[PDB]
Structure formats: C-alpha cells, structure tokens
Amino acid sequence: VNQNAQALNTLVKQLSSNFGAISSVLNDILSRLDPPEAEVQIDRLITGRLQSLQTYVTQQLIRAAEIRASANLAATKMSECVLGQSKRVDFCGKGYHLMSFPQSAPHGVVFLHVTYVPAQEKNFTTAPAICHDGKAHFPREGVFVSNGTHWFVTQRNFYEPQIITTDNTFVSGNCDVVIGIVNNTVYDPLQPELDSF
Amino acid sequence: LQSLQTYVTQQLIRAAEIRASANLAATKMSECVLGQSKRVDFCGKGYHLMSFPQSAPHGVVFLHVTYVPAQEKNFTTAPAICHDGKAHFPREGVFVSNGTHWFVTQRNFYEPQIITTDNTFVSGNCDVVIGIVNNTVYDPLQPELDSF
Amino acid sequence: AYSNNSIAIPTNFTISVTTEILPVSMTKTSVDCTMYICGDSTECSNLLLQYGSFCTQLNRALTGIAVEQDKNTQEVFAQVKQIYKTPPIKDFGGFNFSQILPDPSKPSKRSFIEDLLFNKVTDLICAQKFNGLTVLPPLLTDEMIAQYTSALLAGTITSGWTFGAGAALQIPFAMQMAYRFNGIGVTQNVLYENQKLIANQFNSAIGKIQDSLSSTASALGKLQDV
Amino acid sequence: VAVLYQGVNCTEVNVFQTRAGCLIGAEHVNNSYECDIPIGAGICASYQTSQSIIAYTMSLGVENSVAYSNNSIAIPTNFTISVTTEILPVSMTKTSVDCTMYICGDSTECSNLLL
Numbered sequence A: 001v002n003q004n005a006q007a008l009n010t011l012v013k014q015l016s017s018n019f020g021a022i023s024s025v026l027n028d029i030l031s032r033l034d035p036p037e038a039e040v041q042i043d044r045l046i047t048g049r050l051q052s053l054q055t056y057v058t059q060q061l062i063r064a065a066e067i068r069a070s071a072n073l074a075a076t077k078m079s080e081c082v083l084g085q086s087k088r089v090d091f092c093g094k095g096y097h098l099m100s101f102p103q104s105a106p107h108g109v110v111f112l113h114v115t116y117v118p119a120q121e122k123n124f125t126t127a128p129a130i131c132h133d134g135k136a137h138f139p140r141e142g143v144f145v146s147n148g149t150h151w152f153v154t155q156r157n158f159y160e161p162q163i164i165t166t167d168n169t170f171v172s173g174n175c176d177v178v179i180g181i182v183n184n185t186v187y188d189p190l191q192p193e194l195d196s197f
Numbered sequence B: 001l002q003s004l005q006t007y008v009t010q011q012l013i014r015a016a017e018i019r020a021s022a023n024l025a026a027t028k029m030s031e032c033v034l035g036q037s038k039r040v041d042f043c044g045k046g047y048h049l050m051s052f053p054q055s056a057p058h059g060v061v062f063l064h065v066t067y068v069p070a071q072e073k074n075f076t077t078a079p080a081i082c083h084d085g086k087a088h089f090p091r092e093g094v095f096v097s098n099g100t101h102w103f104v105t106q107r108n109f110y111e112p113q114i115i116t117t118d119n120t121f122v123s124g125n126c127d128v129v130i131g132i133v134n135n136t137v138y139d140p141l142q143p144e145l146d147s148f
Numbered sequence C: 001a002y003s004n005n006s007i008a009i010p011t012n013f014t015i016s017v018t019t020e021i022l023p024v025s026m027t028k029t030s031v032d033c034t035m036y037i038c039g040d041s042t043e044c045s046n047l048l049l050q051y052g053s054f055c056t057q058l059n060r061a062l063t064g065i066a067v068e069q070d071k072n073t074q075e076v077f078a079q080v081k082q083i084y085k086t087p088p089i090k091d092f093g094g095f096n097f098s099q100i101l102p103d104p105s106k107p108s109k110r111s112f113i114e115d116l117l118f119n120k121v122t123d124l125i126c127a128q129k130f131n132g133l134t135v136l137p138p139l140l141t142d143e144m145i146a147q148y149t150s151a152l153l154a155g156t157i158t159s160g161w162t163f164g165a166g167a168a169l170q171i172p173f174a175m176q177m178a179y180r181f182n183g184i185g186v187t188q189n190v191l192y193e194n195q196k197l198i199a200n201q202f203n204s205a206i207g208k209i210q211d212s213l214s215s216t217a218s219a220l221g222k223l224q225d226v
Numbered sequence D: 001v002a003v004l005y006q007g008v009n010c011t012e013v014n015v016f017q018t019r020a021g022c023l024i025g026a027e028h029v030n031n032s033y034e035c036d037i038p039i040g041a042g043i044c045a046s047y048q049t050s051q052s053i054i055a056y057t058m059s060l061g062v063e064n065s066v067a068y069s070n071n072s073i074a075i076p077t078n079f080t081i082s083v084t085t086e087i088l089p090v091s092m093t094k095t096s097v098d099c100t101m102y103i104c105g106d107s108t109e110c111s112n113l114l115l
Helices: A001-018 A026-031 A034-081 A188-194 B002-034 B140-146 C034-038 C042-049 C054-076 C110-119 C123-131 C142-158 C173-183 C187-214 C221-225 D099-103 D108-114
Strands: A096-105 A110-119 A121-127 A135-139 A141-147 A149-152 A169-174 B047-056 B059-069 B072-076 B087-090 B092-096 B102-105 B120-122 C006-010 C013-023 C082-084 D014-016 D022-024 D037-040 D045-050 D052-057 D062-064 D072-077 D079-089
Touching: A001 A034, A026 A034, A026 D108, A034 A096, A034 A110, A034 C054, A034 D079, A034 D099, A121 C173, A121 D062, A135 C187, A141 D072, A149 C142, A169 C187, A188 C034, B002 B047, B002 B059, B002 C054, B002 C142, B002 D014, B047 C142, B047 C173, B059 C110, B072 B092, B092 C006, B102 D079, C013 C187, C034 C042, C082 D052, C110 C142, C173 C187, C187 D037, D099 D108
Parallel strands: C082 D062
Antiparallel strands: A096 A110, A110 D079, A121 A141, A121 D072, A135 A169, A141 A149, B047 B059, B059 C013, B072 C006, B087 B120, B092 B102, D014 D022, D037 D045, D045 D052
C-alpha cells in the first residue's frame, strides 16, 4: 500500500516539473505565445509527460506480474492447505500440516495453520531386526526401541510402547544378512490360548 | 535517460525471472531436500529418496538420490483368487505367476510370497469379478492347530 | 507389449544421481543519474533537475531490486535458524559422503564438489571498478552460504526430516532409507539385503558426478547465461 | 549516522575497513548477534549500548552438534500444537488514468493536437 501511494504521489508530483519549458502550466504558455512558436514547447511537454506515463504503466504492470505470481501461489495454498490436507513440508507452514483457517484481509488474505510439532524427546536403543526362530522379522510400521531390558515396537511420530507380536511384524529373510540384528523372544498370542485350552 | 529507462525495465523483467527461478528452487529446497516428495519428476527423474544441495555462484546445485528400476521379466497376472467360492483380492501388491504357482509381490520389486490369509482379504464372490483364477489359499494356522 | 494377462515387474534396480542447476540471485548494481550524465560540472546538474523525480524513481528501483534480490537468498538458503555440525566419527553403513562434506584442512570452508563449482564458473571485478560501474557485493558471502549448506547436509545425514517438523531427532541413516523406501511402497528388505550393492552404486554414482563436473563445463550454462 | 564508502579502503577520511569498503562513524564489536539493518558481505548494524551504532558480523544462529550413533534413536514422548501466520497478497489498488485530462486539460487546441 505504501509503494502504491508513493507511486501515485510521484505520478502527480511529476506534473509540476517544467520538462524544458518556461513553465509547467499549459494555460500560461497557450495564453502568451502564438501557435507556431508554441508547438515546439508543447511538443517538449508531450514527449516528457509521455515518457513519465510510459514508466508508470510499465512499472505498475511489472507489479501486476508480482501480484499474479503471488495470486497463483495463494490459490495453490488455498487449494492444498485449506480445502484438503497437503503432505508437502514447509508449504502450509513449519511442521506437519493439519488444517487451515482463512481470514479476509485488506488486499490479501491471512492464513492460520494448525501444525503438529514434537516437544520432549528421549534417547532409546534401536535395532534393525529381531531374530527369533532363525528367520528375520521386520517392523511393518515403526521402529524397534528398547529401554535396556525388552525390545518394543513404536511409531516414529510418537511414543506408544507395544509388545513385539506376529501381527506387528512379518517374517522375511534370515538372521545372517541384516547388520545389527539382535536376539530376543517374539511373543505369539496363540501359545497361551492353546495352553489354557 | 531513455537508454537508462530501457536498462531498468530490462532489470525488472529479469528480476521477475530470477525470482521465479528462486521460488521454484525454494520449493525444491523444502520438498526435495528437507523432506521426501512422492511427486514424479519434480525432485528429478525416478522415485525420489533424498536431495543434497550444493553451493554455487549465483545459484544452487542439487544432488538427487532416486530409485530407478533396471531389469524386469514378463509374468502372468490375475485380479483375484477363487478358493472357497469367495473372491480373494490382494491387500498389498499384485498377483504374479511363473507358470506353476501363483505368488504375491509388490509392484516396485519382485519378492515371491505365498498366498496366505493375511496377504489377501475376502470381498464379494467369484462370479462378479472378471478374470479370477482358481488356486489354494494357504491358511497359516492349519498345520499348527493340527499338530497341537 | 500389451496384453491383459501379462505383467512386468522389475527384478533389479539402480540408484541414479542427476543434476539441475537453479540460479538464486543476481549481481546487485546501482547506477547514478548525475554521474552517468557527467561529474564535476554544474551544467549537467541544472539541466538534469528540470526533468523531476526520474532519478529518485530509478534509484529506489535499483534499491528495491537489490533488497528483494537479497531476500531470495534469505528465503531459500537458510530455512531454519539452527546450525548443525558433522560428527567426527563417521559410520554411515558403508557410504562415503566425504565428497559433499566440507574439508576442514582447506583455508576456506568448502566441499570437494563446491570447489569445482567455483572454479568452473568465471580481475573482472577491478576491471568494472575502474570505469565507474559499482557492483554491490551480496550480503551473504561464500563462507556463510557454504555454512548454511553444510548445516543442511549434516542435518539430513544425521537427523533427517525431523528438524523441519520440530526439534532435530537423531536417527541412523541406515534406518533413514528404511522409511524412504517405506514411503514409496517398497519393503525395507531390498535395503537390508542389497546394502552392500547399494554402497558400490552410490559411491560409483558420486564418482561419475565428480567426473562429469570435471570433464564437462557446459552443464553449468544455466548460470553462464546469467 | 555511520557513513559507508563502497569498494574502496580508507583513504581521505572509530574508522574501520570492510570488504564492502571503508566504514566510518560506527564501532566494531568482536561479538556477534542477530542482524537487524543489513549492509552487505556479512556485516550488519544496530543501535545498542551512552548508546551508539555498533557494527558486527552476521550470526548464523545457535550452533548445536547433534549426537549420531548406530544404535542411538530418539522418539518424542510429548508434542505441542502451534499455530503460525503466513501472510500473502492477492490484489492491489485499481487505478485508472485518462490521457487527455492528464496531459492537457481544458484545452481544445491541445486536445486536437493529441489526436
């Protein structure tokens, strides 16, 4: 808004400059000299004022290109961040995006984004795989963590410790390929059910 | 003054050009470098993994690590397996066969896996599905319960 | 070939590294209206003042280009305000990152690849300063942009994608590829079995990039037109 | 006021020399803070402490060395939901200028000469 005001102010204030003539008011020149001596001085005003208007029209149009690059970026954020959920990082704002609230603003729009950021962290011990019967076991979703006693399966985004089971892992490969595999016992829920039966 | 006004006008148009390239580089800085983009041919040719930026005069160089498959072999497919009279649709992956036994594997790599109850799911029946083939879905709990 | 019952699945893969060179900022320049007409004379100044504010508009125009031009490097190079460092003990699982990582033994901090990018792009600065054309220097010198670069590489190699969404969380890079394969729908079994083959694919790909940048100087033409 | 010369050392002339040129009227402090009014080539200035203008090197932010190990992993035990602000423009003030009244108004002879 200040740049538009300064542009309009410069555009008006340039009318007072003489541009090589005797005076800036056209009525005093047309009211004194005859038309044949007068055409050279009016033509000097015409060439100068035309060049000042051509700079203004070109400069405003250059800012129209800036307004269209910002409008297409705003329409892209309006589609992805507001309407849906964008998985893009640092697009909808810092953090994992959730939802966007639009608000009307003069000559623009203000976006309030709700994001998911972690707070407290704790160091854990990890292993790539768990070796049980001689065949490797890999986590389906998440990683193996340990507090120093038992190996747990947990997500990367938050800590919810769970016991290693057959539904949380899958049997593939063996124990001699993967580097860093550790030995522990994989709990099978069918075993106590059959022992009780 | 007119020659200088032409120079400045040329600088603002190239200014819009260097800003459009910088904003596109900032977008690839956020998506390709910082995170992992699943977008195709954005972070470069292939399936994206990680991007390594490098400083260059008046610009930036990105090193993109991508996954491009190389060798393949033609296989025989089918949309479903008809076992007990109900259609078995793949939970993850597609159905492939070497001509003897039907296997289940992902689209990005070939790792033969036997058909089990956990790898498929029962939906509808065998008649409404076009192209279903008959095979035996292995129940993993049957030999353990029989031995017990 | 096109058939309904036929399908093709890849039995093997490769890791390719490509290069896209994207310009960020240009050289900051400011041209004086009076000195462009002439200096040390009042005839240029009295005859130049009758045309009004053209000097102010062209001067604020060059200042506005130079500030937004500085803002593009600020909006791209430094995403975060936190600096990351490379650990002295390096175990990456068989990968050699020493080419893209900076070399502390050099007097100026730079990597092995950035060492080639500055040498393959073309004193001309003093030659322009002799005739009256002032080149304004960028606000961020080469050592700080390279420090921003070393911060994003050291962070993606160690903490990965965590610092974008929050505090940096340390993860082993061997486990970083397990989620990057899990994100595109690929089981981590390819990584864990083929890790030794991937080490030779990545190290050979970095050697091919270093050979391409050293042998072919026309790949940087995106910056050379600028 | 701190006067800055561009691309020349100190010749004619708290007088210090930078890569951008001779900077007079400002004080040089070896410590580094966050920049407010930028100059160029990694130096900025601010009004601080009986107070004056001080010039100093750009700080790139807090330097933290993240621990890295094969078996080490950190998982978050707590989270914080934050709301930020992204400000973007859409439209600008619509202006319309007429050629006749702007160039020469209330003049018939000049209006005929413009056609």
